[PDB]
Amino acid sequence: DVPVNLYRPNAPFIGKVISNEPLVKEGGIGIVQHIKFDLTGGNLKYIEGQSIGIIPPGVDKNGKPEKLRLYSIASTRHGDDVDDKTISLCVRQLEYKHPESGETVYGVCSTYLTHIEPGSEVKITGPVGKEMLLPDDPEANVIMLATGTGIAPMRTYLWRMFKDAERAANPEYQFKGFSWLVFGVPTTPNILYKEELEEIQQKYPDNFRLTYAISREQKNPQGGRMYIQDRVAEHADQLWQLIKNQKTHTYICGLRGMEEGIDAALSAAAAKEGVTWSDYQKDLKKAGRWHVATY
Numbered sequence: 001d002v003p004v005n006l007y008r009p010n011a012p013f014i015g016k017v018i019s020n021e022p023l024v025k026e027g028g029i030g031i032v033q034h035i036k037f038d039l040t041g042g043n044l045k046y047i048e049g050q051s052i053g054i055i056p057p058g059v060d061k062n063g064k065p066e067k068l069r070l071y072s073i074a075s076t077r078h079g080d081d082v083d084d085k086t087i088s089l090c091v092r093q094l095e096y097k098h099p100e101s102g103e104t105v106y107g108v109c110s111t112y113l114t115h116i117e118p119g120s121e122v123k124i125t126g127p128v129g130k131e132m133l134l135p136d137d138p139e140a141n142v143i144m145l146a147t148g149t150g151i152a153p154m155r156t157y158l159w160r161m162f163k164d165a166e167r168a169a170n171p172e173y174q175f176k177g178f179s180w181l182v183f184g185v186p187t188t189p190n191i192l193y194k195e196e197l198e199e200i201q202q203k204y205p206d207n208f209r210l211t212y213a214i215s216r217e218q219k220n221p222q223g224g225r226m227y228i229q230d231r232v233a234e235h236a237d238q239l240w241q242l243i244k245n246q247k248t249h250t251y252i253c254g255l256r257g258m259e260e261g262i263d264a265a266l267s268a269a270a271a272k273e274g275v276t277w278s279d280y281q282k283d284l285k286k287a288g289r290w291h292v293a294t295y
């Protein structure tokens with residue numbers, strides 16, 4: 001029933017860019033774009049928490065055709081306009097500099113995507129992934145631990161749970177559990193989808209909690225910059241108490257490196273009740289209730 005690999009890299013779906021909109025506001029670090037593609041003419045279907053591949057044009061430094069890069073889907077199954085016609089991505093332009101070249105180096109696929117014009121044709125593959133799926137149970141609790149573009153799957157969950165047009169389109173999923181997003185970014189300008197996330201918490205104060213870790217604006221209790229691992233530590237008991245529920249799912253997404261601190265915080269919380277978190281987490285993983293996609 002889960003859609004997978006309706007298109008493959010040997011014969012991709014050629015979609016058209018509808019829009020390319022900035023998500024980083026003035027004063028922010030870097031470039032993150034919300035990109036919506038037209039799926040009409042093909043049969044690419046997908047659900048929340050999945051990814052698609054993008055094949056950028058050109059050859060690599062060895063003259064080989066560029067391979068696909070995976071991007072978390074940022075829209076629900078219905079698309080941003082709830083019409084079942086589009087799919088959206090949340091793409092950061094990769095930029096770093098030296099012990100890999102010259103000065104500033106720009107990622108191939110991400111630079112291609114962030115600068116792409118409406119009307120352009122794009123090679124799309126997928127969808128892919130079954131490890132970040134949202135439960136059908138409307139009484140599930142959902143913890144979301146995201147940094148940067150790791151917000152993308154979280155957006156698909158939250159929009160499905162809480163958007164007016166989504167609730168109207170999805171008779172059989174009227175979310176009534178509790179969801180908690182802890183989202184780490186460097187600045188307030190860098191809070192991707194800020195306005196809509198805060199609008200959701202305002203209309204559903206009992207079903208959605210929003211916690212920021214803003215590194216350039218906040219310090220942890222030890223005086224370092226505030227990161228997501230610091231907020232999880234700050235709320236470790238609360239998060240552990242939620243995780244003990246048989247219906248609670250946790251999702252972690254973003255660039256690698258977050259998980260070690262999250263585990264240390266939850267390990268100290270669980271230890272207070274004689275539970276070794278690493279073991280409990282293994283069982284959660286097996287049960288399909290601990291979801292991770294880092295990159």
Ligand SMILES: Cc1cc2nc3c(=O)[nH]c(=O)nc-3n(C[C@H](O)[C@H](O)[C@H](O)COP(=O)(O)OP(=O)(O)OC[C@H]3O[C@@H](n4cnc5c(N)ncnc54)[C@H](O)[C@@H]3O)c2cc1C
Binds near residue numbers: 093095110
């Ligand atoms: C399941 C999954 C989902 C993803 N979802 C998203 C998403 O929603 N949004 C998003 O923006 N990205 C996402 N990514 C990452 C994305 O696929 C691409 O890896 C990323 O966009 C960079 O690709 P590129 O073509 O721009 O870079 P490339 O041109 O391939 O550059 C990357 C290469 O350069 C090197 N490199 C990268 N960073 C550094 C650094 N700091 N220092 C030194 N060398 C470095 C490495 O060799 C790396 O392989 C996801 C990845 C996966 C696996």
